[PDB]
Structures are given as structure tokens and as C-alpha cells.
């Protein structure tokens, strides 16, 4: 583990070093954010250097027409006055900071941020051609600047800004197999239409096919005209006013009919992927650093509302059922079931690539 990230303020005066950009949320514990900030050979003109980690919601404004314009609203802000060091604030260095100081000297001032564990992971919302500026959604950013006080108007070239991601990965143990079932009883009889469905497993990885086992016991006189299977991304978004959407990210419409007094068992296989979802502006993706492709967003995991973008997935299985009968076409006969599952990356061994690694 011999390389570290660095970025300098445009005027060289300030430089930020970090051991990584992705800090894993393991539900009860988040990797702390530790690096050093290097103040230059009296390129420095300001009287104090702080570092701040901000979790922010980034959005554009629909009412306006300024391409590239976005606004960042803070959800969590922390600061350190690391230059000059403040007494009554003694802290012990990480091993990373200890190495960095040996490499650089006493003018490398450390900073450590422990992240509150109840905060949203980095999520980006799918842009459309119109969206030309920065990626909307939820992002972390470490900021280093040199100023008189925390009230000072911060020159942009006196500062450095680095995007960092807060990410989760798949759990070791899979949950119970996802099974569901529903019974519809109709008006003049008691012989039901029964829908049983199940997924082959509870945790899936991005790009991995999802096998949906469908068991229809149609004891009725109605006919199942089609069977619709869809994978749906659910997004629960909270920024004082909440919002919510469910977006089909993969979908098969089988013209598989179930006769009256019939059973029907068929496996369906769907694979969520982004390529056939590019039209869907606002679809939730794993957080971007600048503009590289990311995958459909992984499932948010939570301890047993909360701000940011909570993502989750369900298979839906819907029987489209013929009408007629006593009520003509006025009442739906349809039958549906929903199968929750987890969609995530496996825990890696090395920190995942910053950019498109074949670029």
C-alpha cells in the first residue's frame, strides 16, 4: 500500500494527501477520513488553514435555464483547524499520518474525520444531455483552505477540494430466500387465483442475472392474459420534504397465458443493467467522483427518516387477468406480488478504481 492521493490548490500553496477516496460504511462503523495537509514555502499568505468534510445534496433548479448550474446544500459539516495546530485538541496520528509526516515534515498537518454512521452513501442521479454541470445527488467532499478566520471569504485558488465517496458492500451472509404469495378470491365463487413467486437468492451483484420462479394456480374462470416481471429500483429521498419513486430497471412481458382451472410454472430471468436505461433521467446510480460511468445504485443498508438517497430493489410479478363477468370491465382482476432483494458489489480486496480504469 505505497501510493497516496494528492491534490494541490491552483496556486500551489496548499496540498492535500489521502490514502484513498472510498470510505466503507460497515453499518455500525465507518472508516475515518484521515490525511495530512501540507502548507508551502511561504507561498502561504493567510493566517490559518482549516479542513472541512461536507456531506451535501447537489441539485439543479428546474425553474431556471442555466445549463451547468447546480446548488450544493449541506447535510453534515465538520471542521478541523489543523494549521496552526490548536492546543486543548491533542490527537494521536494514524499510521498513515505518521508515514506522511516522516515523508514530508512538521509542515504536514494532519486531520481526522470520523463520519456519523447514519448518513447517506454517495449516490448520483442519472443526468440527461441537458444536465452539463456537476453530478447531482449526494456526495462527500474534503475541503482545505487558508483564511484568517472561519468567516473569511475563501479565495478559490487558496483552496483544494476533493470528492470522496461513502460506499457499502454486500454482506457476507445472504438473507433468507425471497418468497412471496398472494391469493385473489373473486365475487361469486371461492376457488381462488393463486400467485406464488420466488427469487433464487437474496443478494445479487451488479450484472448478475435474477431468476424468478413463478407458480400460478388459477382455480378461477378468468384467464391470465399476460405475465409481467419487472425489477424495480425504489428511491426514498429526504431533504426536509421527502420524495419517492419506483422505476422499472428491467422488465419482461411474457405472453404466457393461464387457462381457467390451470396451473402454470415458469422461471423468468432478468438482468438489470444501465445501457438500456439511459433515457431515465434522475435514476439513482452509485456515486460519481467527476463524470465517469457508475452502475445502477447499490442497495442502501441500514441498522435495525434519514437524509439523502435510500435505494432498494424489488422484483414485481403481475398477472394481467381478463375482465367481463358480472362487473364488465369496471373492476380490475389483476394479481401481483413483490420480491425484495439486495443488489450490491462484493467486498473487494483493493480500493475500487477512481476513474474508468481503462480510460
Amino acid at each position, epitope marked *: 500500500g*505505497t*501510493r497516496v492521493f494528492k491534490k494541490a490548490s491552483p496556486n500551489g500553496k496548499l496540498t492535500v494527501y489521502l490514502g484513498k477516496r472510498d470510505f466503507v460504511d460497515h453499518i455500525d462503523l465507518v472508516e475515518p477520513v484521515d490525511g495530512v495537509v501540507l502548507v508551502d514555502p511561504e507561498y502561504l499568505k493567510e493566517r490559518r488553514v482549516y479542513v472541512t468534510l461536507t456531506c451535501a445534496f447537489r441539485y439543479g433548479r428546474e425553474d431556471l435555464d442555466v445549463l451547468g448550474l447546480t446548488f450544493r446544500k449541506d447535510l453534515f459539516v465538520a471542521n478541523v483547524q489543523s494549521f496552526p495546530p490548536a492546543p486543548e485538541d491533542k490527537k494521536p496520528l494514524t499510521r498513515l499520518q505518521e508515514r506522511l509526516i516522516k515523508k514530508l515534515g512538521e509542515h504536514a498537518y494532519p486531520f481526522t474525520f470520523e463520519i456519523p454512521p447514519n448518513l447517506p452513501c454517495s449516490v448520483t442521479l442519472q443526468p440527461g444531455p441537458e444536465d452539463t454541470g456537476k453530478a447531482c445527488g449526494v456526495d462527500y467532499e474534503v475541503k482545505a483552505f487558508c483564511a484568517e478566520n472561519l468567516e473569511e471569504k475563501i479565495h478559490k485558488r487558496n483552496s483544494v477540494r476533493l470528492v470522496i465517496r461513502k460506499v457499502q458492500y454486500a454482506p457476507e451472509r445472504p438473507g433468507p430466500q425471497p418468497t412471496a404469495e398472494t391469493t385473489r378470491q373473486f365475487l361469486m365463487s371461492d376457488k381462488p387465483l393463486h400467485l406464488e413467486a420466488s427469487l433464487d437468492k437474496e443478494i445479487y*451483484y*451488479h*450484472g*448478475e*442475472p435474477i431468476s424468478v420462479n413463478v407458480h400460478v394456480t388459477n382455480n378461477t374462470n378468468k384467464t391470465v392474459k399476460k405475465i409481467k416481471i419487472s425489477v424495480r429500483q425504489y428511491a426514498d429521498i429526504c431533504l426536509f420534504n421527502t420524495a419517492q419513486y419506483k422505476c422499472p430497471v428491467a422488465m419482461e412481458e411474457a405472453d404466457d397465458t393461464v387457462a381457467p382451472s390451470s396451473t402454470f410454472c415458469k422461471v423468468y430471468t432478468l*438482468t438489470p*443493467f*444501465l*445501457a*438500456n436505461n*439511459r433515457e431515465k433521467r434522475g435514476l439513482a446510480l452509485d456515486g460519481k467522483l467527476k463524470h465517469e*460511468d457508475t*452502475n445502477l445504485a447499490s442497495s442502501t443498508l441500514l441498522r435495525e427518516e434519514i437524509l439523502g438517497i435510500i435505494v432498494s430493489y424489488k422484483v414485481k410479478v403481475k398477472l394481467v387477468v381478463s375482465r367481463g363477468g358480472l362487473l364488465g370491465d369496471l373492476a380490475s382482476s389483476d394479481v401481483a406480488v413483490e420480491l425484495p432483494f439486495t443488489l450490491m*458489489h462484493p467486498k473487494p*480486496k*483493493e480500493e*475500487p*478504481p477512481h476513474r474508468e*480504469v*481503462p*480510460e
Partner: antibody
Amino acid sequence: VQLVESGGGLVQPGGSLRLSCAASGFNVYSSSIHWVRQAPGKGLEWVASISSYYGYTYYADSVKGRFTISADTSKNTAYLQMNSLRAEDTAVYYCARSRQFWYSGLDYWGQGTLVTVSS
Amino acid sequence: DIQMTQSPSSLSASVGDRVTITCRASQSVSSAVAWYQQKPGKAPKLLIYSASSLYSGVPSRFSGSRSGTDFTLTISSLQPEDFATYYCQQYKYVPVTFGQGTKVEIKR
């Protein structure tokens, strides 16, 4: 759990060929798929790649304009269709597999298919 | 593009010697380097990725290193098995590019 290439034989100069690479036992939307050619004893040359998860294809400037990488994900197979072939493109073409999340080298190679190009 | 020149390009040693192959990159490719072994008449196989990470199922004796734009593959003691040709690959920039090879033989 294997790659197997197909097609590939003798075709006159300026003609065309289509190779298929049948990917067995891994998920084509979680993997990228590449062709790599190795002339008779001269090292390794990347020629084209494709990401079905993201719908993007990439080429070496050597085969731009006359090679096309495609995928039929229903059949778990990829294709490299090769028209306007020179002697120079004579090689053992390899179908190699990559991990889509994320690229950590070509971790699996096909047994190769030979394509000679001469009159 | 990126040129990846493997230095030794051919070298002799005996079962149990400590060989090192090097590969210098045209420019900074970060750690996006893989190493590959290819036996004759047989398809290349993957040994090391990210410049330093051993691929699953590869003997511990194979090790990758990086020093800025310079990359080494060392084998700590040759076995009868691993007598082959070795290429390095950068994969930080389309077009990914290999090296010319380094043949290692028995030195009897």
C-alpha cells in the same frame, strides 16, 4: 466455465470473416469481452473491447473502419466480424474476458482461433 | 500511446533462482499494470494485477512491484512448471498495450 472461439480459417486478401466466442459459465453483463491477436511469434496486440452493461465498444486504430465487436447476450456469445483483411492481420485471435466491476487484467483467455490471410 | 518495454527480453536461470523482469512505461500509468505468463502453443494466463496483487490460484513465489513508472515481476525461486514467456500490460489508457515478452529457460 470456459471460452471457446469459432470460425476462423483461410480467406483471400481483402475478404471477410466473422469469429464467434462462446462464453460459458460466467455472467456477460458483469464482464467485458475483448479480442487480442498474436501474430506468429510477435507478442500481443489488443484489437477491440465491448461493455454490454454500458453498451460501449472500443477499437484499436489499426482495425477501425473494418472490424466490429458485437454481442448477442441471449446466446452468451460475442462476435468479431472482420472485413477488408490483409496479410498483416494474420494471427491467432484470442477472445479474452474482463471483470466489469472492475477491470483487473484479462483473467481468462480463449484457446485461440487461427485466421490466415493469403492468396 | 503507452509503450511498455520489458527489459531483459530473454534470460536463463535454473530451478530455484530468483529472477526479476522489469517493464518501463512511457508515462505514469498509476498502478494499472498486469503481468501474464504464456506457454508455447497455449493461451496467455494472468499472474498479477494492479501491479502488485497476486491473481487467485497463482503461486506465492510470483510477486509484482512498482516504483513510479517502473514495474518489476520477480519470481523468488523458479520451479519446473513456470518456464515460459512473460508480458506486462498497462491498462490505464485505451489502448491497453503489452510488452514484447521475456523468455525464461532452463539453463542446464
